Design a protein around this ligand. Structure first.
Ligand SMILES: [Zn+2]
Length: 41
């Protein structure tokens, strides 16, 4: 599996958001949907 559609990263929370509650590297090529604006369940 070499092709990865954004739908994959957007379905997997980054350890940053999960552990640090923030992904300062989000601005970088860090994979996953790091959404820290729309706080939802
Ligand atoms: Zn990240």
């Amino acid at each position: 599996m070499d092709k990865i559609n954004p739908d994959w990263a957007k379905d997997i929370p980054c350890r940053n958001i999960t552990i640090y509650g923030y992904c300062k590297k989000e601005k970088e090529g860090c994979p996953f949907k790091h959404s820290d604006n729309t706080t939802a369940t």
